[PDB]
Amino acid sequence: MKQYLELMQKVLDEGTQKNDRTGTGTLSIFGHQMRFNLQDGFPLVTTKRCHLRSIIHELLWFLQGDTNIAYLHENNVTIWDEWADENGDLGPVYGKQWRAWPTPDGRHIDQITTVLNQLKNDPDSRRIIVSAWNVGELDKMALAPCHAFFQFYVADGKLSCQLYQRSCDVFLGLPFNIASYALLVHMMAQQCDLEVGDFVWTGGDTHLYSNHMDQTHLQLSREPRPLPKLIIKRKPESIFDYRFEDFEIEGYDPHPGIKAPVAI
Amino acid sequence: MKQYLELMQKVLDEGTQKNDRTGTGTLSIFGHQMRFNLQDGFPLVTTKRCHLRSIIHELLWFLQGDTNIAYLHENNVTIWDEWADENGDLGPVYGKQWRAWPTPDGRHIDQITTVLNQLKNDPDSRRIIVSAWNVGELDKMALAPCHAFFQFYVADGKLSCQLYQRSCDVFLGLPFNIASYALLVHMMAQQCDLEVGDFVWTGGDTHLYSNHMDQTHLQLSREPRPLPKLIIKRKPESIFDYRFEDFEIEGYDPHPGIKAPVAI
């Protein structure tokens, strides 16, 4: 997409070299904002075929409050394998914090239920937020949340959402993360009878790994194509009732996919 | 300052009338980002006179982990009077979360020292984060955190910081908020023998209250002046050791102040 490629180039022109926790190395910039009007189309990268089946199951996995890759495997999604333990657990990551944030006194907060109820009863609220950054449980996570904090907003009947991503692998993770939240917004909007607004992406340490330069240059040579459109074929009775079969992407004509090693 | 004024005119150019919690009504935009190169000078608003004294005391107060206004009163700062209960308490707000975020297994995390140790021992970490958004204690707070989440970043010997402010009163709070974090960045940098980099402000619900319109355009008709300089006269043994007197702002020649009612 225009802004994606735009950021991709910015990291190359401006990035500083950094030794990261993975002894790989990166080119990064700190602080960046991107804006996607969902009305213009679903923001699934077209300059490289992205596979939505993985994106959808992960999100659904999040919403169920699941942190074990078992489910992902049942649907043959392999993206979190390199992080799970011998039992397939990742710890209290995303899912756990979204659906059952543990209070100091032993009980749990269902942030999603809270958000749905806010959008329906108090959309003008400026506190419609979900946070995966649970300071007291970080040490228990296999990896600290990257898309860590997000807020919803309603205006003129449209639902917008801004995500704060503290760490971003521009080549591998970003195309994935963007489509994920765009999807969620579409689901929230349907469940709250609202139109989709903007998806604002804000990043902290935004980087490009050294061993991704070739595929990054290859990707920068391609012309972005018109964005697909998302169709939700069934309207579930709750935001926790969606299933893979309910989503159809239309008009998605991407450039060939690009293979690249992940930093572990 | 240029960035600040440009933000104001932006809310005015594309803000949407919104009703709000206080019943005052706002002109609101969602999603924004601006940068301040601290080396250019201290980002204290010059188009109106600001109370440096109050800003400093509030920050010192936060760093002490305090949440009762008595301290602010000892030093003639009344900016938190409206939300304090009969005993002067605001609940586990900013200070308490910064210095003692309670975990579900009985521990407390001092996020400030944590961050200090990270900048000294692992500055290239992408997890140097302080969060005030403790979803489990939100309901015990007088007011939910506005400047809710911030990240630090080190590049080429310079310390930068990005703040995510989920709700922003552009006329009244923003000037204070920007100066307050730029101050924090200087302190941290002094304690880590680093140079100051950029302060990146990112906003969620960024608004102008309906009853701030006149004063807003009045300010908008003024020319920014040169930015003041921040001078720290002492390097305390710890970041929790600073005193009001250690700070001296030089060259601050602002326009006349402008009074405006705070929505409670």
Ligand SMILES: CC(C)[C@H](NC(=O)c1ccc(CCc2c[nH]c3nc(N)[nH]c(=O)c23)cc1)C(=O)O
């Ligand atoms: C062929 C595909 C499997 C391949 N995609 C990926 O490798 C991948 C892996 C994990 C994630 C989830 C987010 C994530 C978790 N941990 C991570 N670690 C890194 N370095 N980057 C990430 O994005 C993530 C998204 C994408 C592709 O070619 O598109």
Ligand SMILES: CC(C)[C@H](NC(=O)c1ccc(CCc2c[nH]c3nc(N)[nH]c(=O)c23)cc1)C(=O)O
């Ligand atoms: C002369 C000054 C006293 C005046 N400033 C303020 O009144 C003010 C009050 C509280 C805060 C802290 C954040 C805050 C707490 N509660 C809030 N409530 C609202 N509506 N907005 C805010 O910014 C805050 C910052 C600024 C000025 O002219 O600058």
Ligand SMILES: *c1cc(=O)[nH]c(=O)n1[C@H]1C[C@H](O)[C@@H](COP(=O)(O)O)O1
């Ligand atoms: C909160 C505190 C601060 O440091 N700066 C501010 O700008 N804000 C403002 C935002 C909003 O106008 C009010 C908080 O109310 P709400 O929780 O957003 O309903 O204080």
Ligand SMILES: O=c1ccn([C@H]2C[C@H](O)[C@@H](COP(=O)(O)O)O2)c(=O)[nH]1
């Ligand atoms: O869904 C994800 C998960 C991780 N990251 C990337 C950010 C970093 O490249 C790496 C995480 O490493 P740390 O930031 O924790 O060091 O994974 C993403 O962009 N998206």
